[PDB]
Design an enzyme around this catalytic site. Structure first.
Site, short mmCIF file in Angstrom:
data_model
loop_
_atom_site.label_atom_id
_atom_site.label_comp_id
_atom_site.label_asym_id
_atom_site.label_seq_id
_atom_site.Cartn_x
_atom_site.Cartn_y
_atom_site.Cartn_z
N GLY A 170 0.69 -1.53 0.24
CA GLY A 170 0.06 0.14 0.18
C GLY A 170 0.64 1.13 -0.12
N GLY B 28 3.27 7.13 3.50
CA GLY B 28 3.94 6.42 2.74
C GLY B 28 4.08 5.31 1.81
CB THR B 29 4.98 3.12 0.00
OG1 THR B 29 5.24 2.10 -1.01
CG2 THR B 29 6.45 3.46 -0.32
CE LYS C 99 4.24 4.48 8.44
NZ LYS C 99 2.97 5.61 9.43
CG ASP D 87 -7.46 7.95 13.62
OD1 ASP D 87 -5.81 7.84 12.60
OD2 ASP D 87 -7.90 7.19 12.80
C1 LIG Z 1 -2.79 -4.22 2.19
C2 LIG Z 1 -1.75 -4.09 3.81
N1 LIG Z 1 -1.37 -5.41 3.75
C3 LIG Z 1 -0.21 -5.52 5.56
C4 LIG Z 1 0.28 -6.53 5.30
N2 LIG Z 1 0.82 -6.25 6.77
C5 LIG Z 1 0.67 -5.40 7.51
N3 LIG Z 1 1.18 -4.50 8.77
C6 LIG Z 1 1.49 -4.20 9.05
C7 LIG Z 1 1.54 -4.20 10.92
C8 LIG Z 1 1.60 -3.16 11.36
N4 LIG Z 1 1.11 -1.36 10.93
C9 LIG Z 1 0.39 -1.35 10.03
N5 LIG Z 1 0.62 -0.15 9.38
C10 LIG Z 1 0.33 -0.20 8.33
C11 LIG Z 1 0.36 1.35 8.09
C12 LIG Z 1 -0.36 1.52 8.89
C13 LIG Z 1 0.08 3.28 9.36
C14 LIG Z 1 -2.22 1.53 9.32
N6 LIG Z 1 -2.38 2.89 9.07
O1 LIG Z 1 -3.11 0.47 8.88
C15 LIG Z 1 -0.80 1.07 10.53
N7 LIG Z 1 0.92 -2.59 9.25
C16 LIG Z 1 0.07 -4.51 6.68
C17 LIG Z 1 -0.53 -4.17 5.75
N8 LIG Z 1 -1.70 -3.62 4.97
C18 LIG Z 1 -1.33 -1.97 4.64
C19 LIG Z 1 -1.20 -1.24 4.50
C20 LIG Z 1 -3.05 -1.95 5.55
#
Ligand SMILES: Cc1nc2cnc(Nc3ccnc(N4CC[C@@](C)(C(N)=O)C4)n3)cc2n1C(C)C
Length: 301
Positions: free
Chosen positions: A24, A29-30, A50, A140
């Site tokens: 994502g 960011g990415t 991240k 949030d």
């Molecule tokens: C599509 C997708 N597949 C994933 C697999 N694993 C994670 N792992 C984790 C674990 C803990 N935190 C997060 N992040 C994702 C971005 C974040 C800042 C958010 N807003 O959800 C926290 N990802 C995130 C993943 N995504 C995101 C971009 C929703």
């Protein structure tokens, strides 16, 4: 005064892990799917990386999130595995293969039954009750910030706002006076439950964020989802009281949803319920593959 935070911030070498593909891209960011092969440990940990343009203020924001994320340890909360000190600065997190719950309920509506929905509610309440124990206000909570490890195991994430704006998820005191308590997270929990029970609907769709404050002040709330019994809707409504102390406590939400999850069909009415199937780790090809260990089983250096 307060208890010292003895959490370990783990610094990981760039060479210790690899980026496989992009999962994502957003405001942050990415996020990349990755693999972490530590030192000479003979393990491969599936990870989410991240990554951030570089500016000093952006680095402060990512390091503030790393601080909070390394300070948590609960089965229903996303912990920080480590950081990598590149010019950019990367956060290494646990790979949640099924992504966010919001997209999950939208994509799998026809296979999600009362048991899963109710179990998810219990799990979020547990994660939130843990954050309350750690004296941590999320600020949030939403279905987009609940990630799916397996369809049977979900975790709370995004500590970018977490302390000791998303209007349509906020308590009225928060919108009007910028007051954020654990009871303000209870309001957000109410909305998250509504997002699940509607199979990913947008709360107050078509209504602008500036109208929300007035709408809530008048006494208007999110409608009763068709699958919800008055029992479940009553819980949602209680999370949306003007009086914060009148709203339920997370520990009470655990109890309430647990009682209900023991007889799911009595509290959620879904067409074709129980005849529904979701991927389980007892399914063919659910998972090089050799020496792959999940983060939840990989402990200390
Ligand atoms: C599509 C997708 N597949 C994933 C697999 N694993 C994670 N792992 C984790 C674990 C803990 N935190 C997060 N992040 C994702 C971005 C974040 C800042 C958010 N807003 O959800 C926290 N990802 C995130 C993943 N995504 C995101 C971009 C929703």
């Amino acid at each position: 005064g307060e208890a010292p935070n003895q959490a370990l911030l783990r610094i990981l070498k760039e060479t210790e892990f690899k980026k496989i593909k992009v999962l994502g891209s957003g405001a942050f960011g990415t996020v990349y799917k990755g693999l972490w092969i530590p030192e000479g440990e003979k393990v491969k940990i599936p990870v989410a990386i991240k990554e951030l343009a570089t500016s000093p203020k952006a680095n402060k924001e990512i390091l503030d999130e790393a601080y909070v994320m390394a300070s948590v340890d609960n089965p229903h909360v996303c912990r920080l595995l480590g950081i990598c000190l590149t010019s950019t600065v990367q956060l290494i997190m646990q790979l949640m293969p099924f992504g966010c719950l919001l997209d999950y309920v939208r994509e799998h509506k026809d296979n999600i039954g009362s048991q899963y929905l109710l179990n998810w509610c219990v799990q979020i309440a547990k994660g939130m009750n843990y954050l309350e124990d750690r004296r941590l206000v999320h600020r949030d909570l939403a279905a987009r910030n609940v990630l799916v490890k397996t369809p049977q195991h979900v975790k709370i994430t995004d500590f970018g706002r977490a302390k000791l704006v998303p209007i349509k998820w906020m308590a009225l005191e928060s919108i009007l006076h910028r007051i954020y308590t654990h009871q303000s997270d209870v309001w957000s929990y109410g909305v998250t439950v509504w997002e699940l029970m509607t199979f990913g609907s947008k709360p107050y769709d078509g209504i602008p964020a500036s109208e929300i404050s007035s709408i809530l002040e008048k006494g208007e709330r999110l409608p009763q989802p068709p699958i919800c019994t008055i029992d479940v809707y009553m819980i949602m409504v209680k999370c949306w009281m003007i009086d914060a102390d009148s709203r339920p406590k997370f520990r009470e939400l655990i109890i309430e949803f647990s009682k209900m999850a023991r007889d799911p069909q009595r509290y959620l009415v879904i067409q074709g319920d129980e005849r529904m199937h979701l991927p389980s780790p007892t399914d063919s090809n659910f998972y090089d593959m050799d020496d792959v260990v999940d983060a939840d089983e990989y402990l200390i250096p």
